[PDB]
Amino acid sequence: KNAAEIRQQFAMTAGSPIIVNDKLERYAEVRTAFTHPTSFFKPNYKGEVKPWFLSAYDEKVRQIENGENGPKMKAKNVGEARAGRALEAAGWTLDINYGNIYPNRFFMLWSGETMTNTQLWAPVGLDRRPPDTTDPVELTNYVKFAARMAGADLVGVARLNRNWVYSEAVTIPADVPYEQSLHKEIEKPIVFKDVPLPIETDDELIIPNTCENVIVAGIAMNREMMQTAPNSMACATTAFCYSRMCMFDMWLCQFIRYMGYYAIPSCNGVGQSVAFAVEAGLGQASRMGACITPEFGPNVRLTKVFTNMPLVPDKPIDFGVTEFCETCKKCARECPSKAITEGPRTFEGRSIHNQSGKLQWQNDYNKCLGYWPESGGYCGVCVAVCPFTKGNIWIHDGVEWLIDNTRNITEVWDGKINTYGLDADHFRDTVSFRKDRV
Amino acid sequence: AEKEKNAAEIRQQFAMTAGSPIIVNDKLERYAEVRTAFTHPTSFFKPNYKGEVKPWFLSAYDEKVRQIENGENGPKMKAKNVGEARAGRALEAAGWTLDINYGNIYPNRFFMLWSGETMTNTQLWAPVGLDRRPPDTTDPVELTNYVKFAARMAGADLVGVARLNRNWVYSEAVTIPADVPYEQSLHKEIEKPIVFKDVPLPIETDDELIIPNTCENVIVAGIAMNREMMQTAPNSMACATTAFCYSRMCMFDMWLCQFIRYMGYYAIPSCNGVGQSVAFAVEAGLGQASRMGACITPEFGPNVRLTKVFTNMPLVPDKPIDFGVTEFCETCKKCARECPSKAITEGPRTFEGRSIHNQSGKLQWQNDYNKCLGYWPESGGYCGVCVAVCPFTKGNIWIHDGVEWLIDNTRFLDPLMNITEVWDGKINTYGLDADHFRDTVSFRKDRVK
Numbered sequence: 001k002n003a004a005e006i007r008q009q010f011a012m013t014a015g016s017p018i019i020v021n022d023k024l025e026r027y028a029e030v031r032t033a034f035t036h037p038t039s040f041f042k043p044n045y046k047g048e049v050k051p052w053f054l055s056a057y058d059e060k061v062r063q064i065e066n067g068e069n070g071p072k073m074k075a076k077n078v079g080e081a082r083a084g085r086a087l088e089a090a091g092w093t094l095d096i097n098y099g100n101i102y103p104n105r106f107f108m109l110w111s112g113e114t115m116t117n118t119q120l121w122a123p124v125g126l127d128r129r130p131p132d133t134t135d136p137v138e139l140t141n142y143v144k145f146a147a148r149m150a151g152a153d154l155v156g157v158a159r160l161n162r163n164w165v166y167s168e169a170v171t172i173p174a175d176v177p178y179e180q181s182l183h184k185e186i187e188k189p190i191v192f193k194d195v196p197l198p199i200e201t202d203d204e205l206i207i208p209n210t211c212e213n214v215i216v217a218g219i220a221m222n223r224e225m226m227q228t229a230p231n232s233m234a235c236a237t238t239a240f241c242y243s244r245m246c247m248f249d250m251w252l253c254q255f256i257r258y259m260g261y262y263a264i265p266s267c268n269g270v271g272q273s274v275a276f277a278v279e280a281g282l283g284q285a286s287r288m289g290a291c292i293t294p295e296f297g298p299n300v301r302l303t304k305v306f307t308n309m310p311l312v313p314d315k316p317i318d319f320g321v322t323e324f325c326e327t328c329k330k331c332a333r334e335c336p337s338k339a340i341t342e343g344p345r346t347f348e349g350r351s352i353h354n355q356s357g358k359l360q361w362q363n364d365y366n367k368c369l370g371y372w373p374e375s376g377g378y379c380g381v382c383v384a385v386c387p388f389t390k391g392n393i394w395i396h397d398g399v400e401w402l403i404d405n406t407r408n409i410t411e412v413w414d415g416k417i418n419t420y421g422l423d424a425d426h427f428r429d430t431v432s433f434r435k436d437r438v
Numbered sequence: 439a440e441k442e443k444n445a446a447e448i449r450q451q452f453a454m455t456a457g458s459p460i461i462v463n464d465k466l467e468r469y470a471e472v473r474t475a476f477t478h479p480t481s482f483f484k485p486n487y488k489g490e491v492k493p494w495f496l497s498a499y500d501e502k503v504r505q506i507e508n509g510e511n512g513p514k515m516k517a518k519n520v521g522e523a524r525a526g527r528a529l530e531a532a533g534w535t536l537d538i539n540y541g542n543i544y545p546n547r548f549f550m551l552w553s554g555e556t557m558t559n560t561q562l563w564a565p566v567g568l569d570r571r572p573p574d575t576t577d578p579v580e581l582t583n584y585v586k587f588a589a590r591m592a593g594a595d596l597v598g599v600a601r602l603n604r605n606w607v608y609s610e611a612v613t614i615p616a617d618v619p620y621e622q623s624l625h626k627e628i629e630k631p632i633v634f635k636d637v638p639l640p641i642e643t644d645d646e647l648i649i650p651n652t653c654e655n656v657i658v659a660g661i662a663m664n665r666e667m668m669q670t671a672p673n674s675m676a677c678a679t680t681a682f683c684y685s686r687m688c689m690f691d692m693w694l695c696q697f698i699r700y701m702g703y704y705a706i707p708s709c710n711g712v713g714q715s716v717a718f719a720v721e722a723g724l725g726q727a728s729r730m731g732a733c734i735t736p737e738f739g740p741n742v743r744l745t746k747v748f749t750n751m752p753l754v755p756d757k758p759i760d761f762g763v764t765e766f767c768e769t770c771k772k773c774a775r776e777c778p779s780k781a782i783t784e785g786p787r788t789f790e791g792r793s794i795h796n797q798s799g800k801l802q803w804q805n806d807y808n809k810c811l812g813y814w815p816e817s818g819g820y821c822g823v824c825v826a827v828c829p830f831t832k833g834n835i836w837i838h839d840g841v842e843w844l845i846d847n848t849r850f851l852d853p854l855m856n857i858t859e860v861w862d863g864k865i866n867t868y869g870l871d872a873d874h875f876r877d878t879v880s881f882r883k884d885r886v887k
């Protein structure tokens with residue numbers, strides 16, 4: 001089992017793998033099921049219509065009171081039910097409003113100037129000193145090393161494709177306090193202009209034309225916990241990884257700034273992570289819609305940082321995911337809301353929530369979100385059942401690597417765990433030396 | 439055949455019976471935090487390389503800047519080029535992103551809030567009421583398993599529980615007034631007593647930081663640093679693994695406190711504040727005190743950072759461990775010989791503090807920590823040479839003789855009988871090492887008995 005060998009073997013020639021037509025336009029973030037007016041409101045189990053996450057809260061409370069870890073899933077006792085939800089809620093500590101999407105707010109600042117760390121370090125002047133390194137080869141090695149220090153299990157670099165950057169972001173006015181944020185979300189254009197630094201005006205989020213590159217990180221979720229989907233421990237590994245995303249973005253942006261460049265964090269905001277991840281060679285797009293990686297399958301979170309730092313783009317990877325998803329359809333059969341299509345890929349979105357103009361499996365994401373208040377979590381059954389999520393799907397026939405075609409919650413709490421939920425049985429797969437960084 | 443290393447076995451073999459291992463006598467009094475070398479007026483000021491007397495960290499900054507300009511990664515250590523020198527300091531600086539003023543010591547300020555109520559996460563989750571609902575679990579056995587599982591999720595490589603020994607809680611904390619903005623914080627530090635009272639929840643008044651008498655337990659976490667980077671001490675990459683682990687500590691405290699709160703209990707974070715981490719770690723069984731003064735663990739030696747959380751959550755205390763560190767430190771003295779400031783004693787343990795920076799009244803090796811801090815502006819970093827040269831920091835110390843585990847004495851022979859390569863070499867997530875990561879795997883049996 002050698003991940004470096006595997007990635008080398010399945011490396012493509014250069015060029016975005018995403019097939020597009022002339023109808024493709026940048027996508028307004030408000031259109032996602034989380035935020036759009038058509039999908040935002042959902043009934044709770046009492047028949048009261050609320051913001052989807054508030055109705056999901058009502059189900060978490062009902063489950064705790066009834067000693068359940070998920071829908072129709074009895075916990076060992078009320079204590080266990082409570083612990084799962086306590087772990088879930090805690091995981092989100094370093095995340096704003098489920099995904100950190102508002103750009104240049106809270107943790108996602110587009111400049112480091114006001115950060116306590118930057119202020120403390122100001123006399124050294126690292127963020128003001130011109131770069132001492134402009135060589136993209138050395139920079140790629142440096143920033144990838146920093147990325148691993150910052151908590152990425154996978155890291156890749158692509159040229160920034162503006163097609164995947166949201167046309168308009170969901171955000172809040174800059175002087176609105178957190179307690180009012182959910183009630184004062186607004187739309188705001190993201191535009192590219194000839195300016196020296198990322199800047200936000202009253203009217204626009206402005207990314208410089210010099211913002212050449214995107215650095216994409218994979219943040220691995222815990223297999224045992226995700227396999228409890230749609231129950232509470234799947235929610236907990238999801239949540240902890242969002243806080244890991246946030247710390248990754250801040251750490252890496254600060255490193256890049258202290259190297260003499262600018263850096264834009266994003267977590268779930270600014271653009272479509274799956275498209276960037278595919279273009280940066282982390283994995284391939286799949287039927288369920290996720291980026292499937294050789295190391296973790298789809299059981300990995302994504303975040304990304306945009307920068308003018310000169311870098312060497314990674315090659316896209318083709319290890320046969322498209323052909324496997326063609327015949328598999330297991331996520332689609334197991335999906336509790338029938339959100340995932342069993343049909344062929346097309347360029348035409350199923351609803352407002354899809355971006356038309358790119359060849360993909362088109363899924364109904366309102367159907368997906370509808371299951372979240374019903375189950376009181378973030379589901380994840382598709383991730384859990386995907387063959388690529390299983391530990392070792394990789395075999396070697398003596399010449400090369402190939403996919404092996406052949407492929408409760410109390411026990412999780414009482415079972416194997418390790419730091420950040422990583423697994424020492426597999427952790428060697430993400431070891432890195434210079435040769436695999438650049 | 440070679441027996442595969444079993445860290446759980448090793449800890450079981452060397453487990454002690456219950457009781458604080460730290461030997462004390464009647465001169466022992468709680469220690470005022472302002473006495474540490476970082477904060478005390480006698481030690482706080484250090485000359486820079488031009489002889490200008492400044493706050494120690496400002497003089498160290500001057501040296502970092504000088505090194506970058508001169509293409510160096512440390513004192514008299516030439517870098518590959520200026521770009522490499524720059525990169526090491528950029529990585530170091532970035533590492534500190536989630537840490538306030540080198541340690542997060544001010545209690546109930548910034549990240550170290552003693553209540554979760556104002557946190558954005560708590561506000562978002564308020565409708566579920568997890569922080570208001572009485573505990574559904576009071577069994578200390580189940581709580582210990584739950585909270586240790588949460589601790590591993592929250593980034594701890596080691597976790598242990600002890601009853602809170604107030605002897606190691608600072609008598610007065612270093613902090614700032616609540617109305618003082620971050621940019622003035624380093625100018626406006628004050629002392630505030632930490633007191634124990636019959637109150638329901640941790641609370642701060644104008645005059646006191648008040649910990650409830652019900653605050654029974656301390657949870658101690660070990661946060662592993664990176665071996666390859668620390669072995670570059672006193673140069674910049676050792677500074678970088680130090681820095682990143684401080685931000686990991688902060689994340690750990692906030693994550694774990696929120697879990698404990700959402701379980702229906704209260705929780706006090708601390709990072710480098712509130713009390714003496716080495717003493718708590720020893721009492722919680724993470725490892726043993728050592729000549730250099732650090733807690734030496736079987737897994738990482740001293741090359742591991744510590745943080746701690748205080749709580750009324752019922753828990754099962756862990757047993758202390760004795761794997762012979764004291765007897766090795768008695769005869770080894772490598773850290774003392776290699777220390778660039780001669781801060782570490784080569785003499786025996788005593789109950790008498792060397793200077794104001796030591797807490798008298800506990801049996802320990804007494805080191806001169808003003809001498810230690812003095813080397814930091816000189817070298818432009820946080821040194822760490824003692825951690826780097828300690829044989830317990832090597833990954834290779836444990837052997838099995840067919841009957842039991844033991845320490846390989848050959849690793850202590852004296853004499854034994856670069857930074858570019860680190861940047862170009864092995865790394866993995868959070869700087870953890872997959873060659874050793876199995877050592878911190880955990881099942882219920884090793885979380886609670």
Ligand code: SF4
Pocket residue numbers: 286287288289324325326328329330331332382385386387388
């Ligand atoms: S379950 Fe099957 S069809 Fe769905 S994403 Fe995984 S491999 Fe593709």
Ligand code: SF4
Pocket residue numbers: 334335336337338339340367368369371378379380381382383
């Ligand atoms: S998360 Fe659940 S409901 Fe949503 S697509 Fe996956 S399986 Fe279906």
Ligand code: SF4
Pocket residue numbers: 728729730731766767768770771772773774824827828829830
């Ligand atoms: S170097 Fe030797 S004396 Fe110093 S702490 Fe390590 S084992 Fe003890």
Ligand code: SF4
Pocket residue numbers: 776777778779780781782809810811813820821822823824825
């Ligand atoms: S950090 Fe350096 S100066 Fe301080 S005690 Fe250790 S070796 Fe000596």
